[PDB]
């Protein structure tokens, strides 16, 4: 039933966790919360134990806490970080204040991988394949990551990859132009844009659009993919945005094969399909998986989709204690994955 908890202060923060978690070592903090690496004696895995900071300090924060826990509890896929555990030392709703989330502490992120070796084209195929496999799953539940970048991808020594740190709000180099300047509502293919940016960088050893501010980055993007045509302009809601875009000197799309010389032409072809300015015309994660670049990895019987994910809570208008109570319910109903 309820584990035995033990209590310790580490770096001016109290941690009260089940004794199954041992040898906690602080590894960073922030506005989100605060994290320790630990050894999970039940699974034998190294884990990140995140203690949320001020999870219920306002309506806004309480709803965000609920949103995060709902999302993490739903994700069950080999290429997406899942929730190993969630707990509170509280014995009742009335003493409920703290929430702890436990996830696998896997390998290193994609940046650190690149720092210690040169990837082969085979590596890039397999890494991007797994990102897209994860995205097919996420997108099939109408979840959008929103914040894909190398530091949000975990990789182990077998080159196995997981997507983590979903964007929970409702650098900038990997972000689709339409969300960066708020041109329109996000669709799932903002994540596909990010993948294109990540893949380009894995192939070339250079950030694709390293802009210093929003305008500089837009200009680098438009130089590659060309300025918007009338069809895309029609979909941009802000009159000011439209006026600004129309103010730019027109530019043709570049030939990507000139931009990525010496790379696998099938890789370049996939990039052309991911980095299209109009999001409705970008390749989807499902379609990209069937792309010839991934022929050695693609298995249509092993690219699963997700259960539907009910996000109707997003339009509820509730009291702080109501979000807190819904959160508590989710802590209580949590069932760990098979050991």
């Amino acid at each position: 039933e309820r584990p035995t908890f033990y209590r310790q202060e580490l770096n001016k923060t109290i941690w009260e966790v089940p004794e199954r978690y041992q040898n906690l070592s602080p590894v960073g903090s922030g506005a989100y919360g605060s994290v320790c690496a630990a050894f999970d004696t039940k699974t034998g895995l190294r884990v990140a134990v995140k203690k949320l900071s001020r999870p219920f300090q306002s309506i806004i924060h309480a709803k965000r806490t609920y949103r995060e826990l709902r999302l993490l509890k739903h994700m069950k896929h080999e290429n997406v970080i899942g929730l190993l555990d969630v707990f509170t030392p509280a014995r009742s709703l009335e003493e409920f204040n703290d929430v702890y989330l436990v996830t696998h502490l896997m390998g290193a992120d994609l940046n650190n991988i690149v720092k210690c070796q040169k990837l082969t084209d085979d590596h890039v195929q397999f890494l991007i394949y797994q990102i897209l496999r994860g995205l097919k799953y996420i997108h099939s539940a109408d979840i959008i990551h929103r914040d894909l970048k190398p530091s949000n991808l975990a990789v182990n020594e077998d080159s196995e990859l997981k997507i983590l740190d979903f964007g929970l709000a409702r650098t900038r180099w990997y972000r689709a132009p339409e969300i960066m300047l708020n041109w329109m509502h996000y669709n799932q293919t903002v994540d596909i844009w990010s993948v294109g940016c990540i893949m380009a960088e894995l192939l070339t050893g250079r950030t694709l659009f390293p802009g210093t501010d929003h305008i500089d980055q837009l200009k680098l993007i438009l130089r590659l993919v060309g300025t918007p045509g009338a069809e895309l302009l029609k979909k941009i809601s802000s009159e000011s945005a439209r006026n600004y875009i129309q103010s730019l000197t027109q530019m043709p799309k570049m030939n990507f094969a000139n931009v990525f010389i010496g790379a696998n032409p099938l890789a370049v072809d996939l990039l052309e399909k991911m980095l299209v300015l109009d999001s409705d015309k970008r390749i989807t994660a499902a379609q990209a998986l069937a792309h010839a670049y991934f022929a050695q990895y693609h298995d249509p019987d092993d690219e699963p989709v997700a259960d539907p994910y009910d996000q109707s809570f997003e339009s509820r208008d509730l009291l702080i204690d109501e979000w807190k109570s819904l959160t508590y319910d989710e802590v209580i109903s949590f069932v760990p994955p098979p050991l």
Binding site: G107, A108, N112, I113, K115, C116, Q117, T120, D122, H123, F126, V155, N156, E157, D158, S159, E160
Partner: peptide, 8 residues
Amino acid sequence: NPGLKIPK
């Protein structure tokens, strides 16, 4: 599966 060095 290709292999990788994990820092460090």
